[PDB]
Design a protein around this ligand. Structure first.
Ligand SMILES: O=c1ccn([C@H]2C[C@H](O)[C@@H](COP(=O)(O)NP(=O)(O)OP(=O)(O)O)O2)c(=O)[nH]1
Ligand SMILES: O=c1ccn([C@H]2C[C@H](O)[C@@H](COP(=O)(O)NP(=O)(O)OP(=O)(O)O)O2)c(=O)[nH]1
Ligand SMILES: O=c1ccn([C@H]2C[C@H](O)[C@@H](COP(=O)(O)NP(=O)(O)OP(=O)(O)O)O2)c(=O)[nH]1
Ligand SMILES: [Mg+2]
Ligand SMILES: [Mg+2]
Ligand SMILES: [Mg+2]
Lengths: 145, 145, 144
């Protein structure tokens, strides 16, 4: 669909792979060990710099297994990697558990998902068109069946 | 439009609905009652298995009302449901509040949003093209100026 | 490109800007001060109402800097702003730190990213096609 130029900047850097054929995302591998204390955050280096084809972004998303089993997630999920970013890809992991969480070298601790981007042009208006939803949000449709 | 084949695998399973005509997401209904303690996570079963038309993924997203009013969210938001996944759709709910949170059968506790997928091919390079953002990230553009 | 009609409903409201030329998102500016206590949430008003071109949604996403440095994030990230919503854009910020976090007027405390929407029609089936992933999820591919 699209091309990503990848520059490795760490000996342990891995080109990400789609772990199944129909996978949305490719898993991101830590290049260094990081210990994340209870109720804190750590910054995990992926040791890669990217140039996405124009018109695409990369989302950095939480992996479901680590969330369920260790209460670890990507704190800024979905992390926005901009088309024009040329720095190192890094992942902000939060440990919401009561236990230490250790990231080892090669551990897949997030997934990257490419999405097409769409630029907005804003037009100032005195009034908007009316809809049925209108100003309803934040639970306006209820919870209970 | 696109089509989703849905198989109900639990007696309390419900076909998800778009709650307003221009809603992005369709709401996902719990099939079991689950109590989620303060500062913990619970697994909510939706009792459905999906086959999305090829080319599409499902995102499992937090509902704003429950986040604001109960500090309940989908811990892996946006949860990645792969085109090729044929298992049961499940939601990891975190309770970040100090109060017990009870999910009742039929409760709409997350939403599914269909998105088109875009597969990357990686080309490894020695150097990338330069941009004005460059390696600036993690707050490089400031907060108040 | 696509068009968003924007109505300001607060004197401090700003038209959001893409902060770099290749930025996915436009930053959302608070119009009122909000104090968010440790392990709490606050609702931040952006003072704008939108009408997106049909076929598009707005995602309200966490900014990486504030998450890393202050453990502040958008609690419902990515927040779903529906095509048919005509109310004020608001941001649910959670403070997961042990320190007070103050939002000042003008502070860019989230970003908006436009995405195209795709409406599903459900067809109920007794059986689904088989795949290689099959029922594997929640760690089925490993961590190492
Ligand atoms: O970050 C957000 C998310 C939602 N909203 C508004 C606009 C959106 O169209 C509306 C509903 O969003 P959700 O469907 O994500 N939340 P929920 O299902 O609780 O509310 P509702 O019952 O109104 O659909 O709330 C915001 O202003 N900010
Ligand atoms: O998960 C992430 C998110 C961001 N980043 C990098 C790439 C992105 O282009 C850059 C800025 O992302 P955000 O705009 O989401 N963060 P923030 O607005 O704080 O930073 P900046 O001021 O540089 O835009 O940070 C990562 O490496 N990982
Ligand atoms: O919110 C979610 C996310 C995932 N899933 C299922 C479907 C998805 O295809 C599968 C794997 O999702 P992730 O890739 O996000 N999780 P992880 O990488 O831990 O599992 P796996 O190793 O199977 O890919 O889990 C859910 O049911 N709900
Ligand atoms: Mg996975
Ligand atoms: Mg809703
Ligand atoms: Mg930014």
């Amino acid at each position: 669909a699209m091309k990503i130029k990848i520059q490795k900047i760490h000996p342990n850097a891995l080109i990400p792979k789609y772990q199944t054929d129909g996978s949305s995302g490719f898993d991101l591998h830590a290049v260094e060990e990081v210990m994340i204390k209870p109720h804190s955050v750590g910054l995990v280096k992926i040791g890669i710099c990217l140039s996405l084809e124009v018109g695409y972004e990369l989302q950095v998303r939480t992996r479901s297994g680590l969330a369920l089993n260790h209460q670890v997630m990507v704190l800024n999920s979905p992390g926005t990697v901009d088309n024009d970013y040329r720095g190192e890809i890094k992942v902000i992991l939060a440990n919401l558990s009561d236990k230490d969480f250790k990231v080892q070298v090669g551990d897949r601790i997030a997934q990257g998902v490419v999405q097409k981007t769409y630029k907005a042009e804003f037009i100032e208006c005195e009034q908007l068109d009316e809809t049925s939803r209108g100003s309803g949000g934040f639970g306006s449709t209820g919870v209970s069946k």
